[PDB]
Design a protein around this ligand. Structure first.
Ligand SMILES: COc1ccc(C[C@H](NC(=O)O[C@H]2CCO[C@H]3OC[C@H](O)[C@H]32)[C@H](O)CN(CC(C)C)S(=O)(=O)c2ccc(OC)cc2)cc1
Lengths: 99, 99
């Protein structure tokens, strides 16, 4: 689909058997989701944004469905204010910027 | 142009007579630029991101050139880790997901 930006570019995702909404985020290298229950092992990680840093758990090779497009990659879970789909997953669904 | 996301989507901007690089940021409602010299009156504002909140100066009706596309709007200036072009200006230059 083509998505314009007059509104937040929110899409439906399915991950860990659960449905959520997430923001397509070109300003995000990685994907960061609010606290959720994800299955297997993880690693502690720290990531910085505009106002400082948060602790997140890193899950590798997680399957995620983003607006009907399946991708597998790293997902970070932690006290992010919004679910963010970063470029790591955006490239998998073939997402581009255009103007 | 069309821009893929295997790399940060950085573009050249000109603002306040100065040249800078900035990230095209669909995850950002507003535009936030690192500390720089801008002329005129401004207003205090607080903005939140992943790790907390920062104080910025809000400048309205600012002319900015983004990869050769002129836009006029609000620019926030403060201790952001990177220059980010938000949806407020992305809509003006017609930025989407076209191909
Ligand atoms: C470290 O330097 C920064 C710093 C910041 C970024 C923009 C942000 N992305 C972000 O926080 O990325 C994090 C998590 C993903 O992996 C990484 O990608 C780069 C960064 O290192 C990591 C994000 O897209 C835009 N944010 C809005 C989000 C809902 C929080 S916002 O910057 O806080 C913001 C802008 C405007 C506004 O108006 C009122 C309010 C807030 C990118 C680089």
């Amino acid at each position: 689909p083509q998505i314009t930006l007059w509104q937040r570019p929110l899409v439906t995702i399915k991950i860990g058997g659960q449905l959520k909404e997430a923001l397509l985020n070109t300003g995000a290298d990685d994907t960061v989701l609010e606290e959720m229950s994800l299955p297997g092992r993880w690693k502690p990680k720290m990531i910085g944004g505009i106002g400082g840093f948060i602790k997140v758990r890193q899950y590798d090779q997680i399957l995620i469905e983003i607006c009907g497009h399946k991708a597998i990659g790293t997902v970070l879970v932690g006290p992010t204010p919004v679910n963010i789909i970063g470029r790591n997953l955006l490239t998998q669904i073939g997402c581009t910027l255009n103007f």
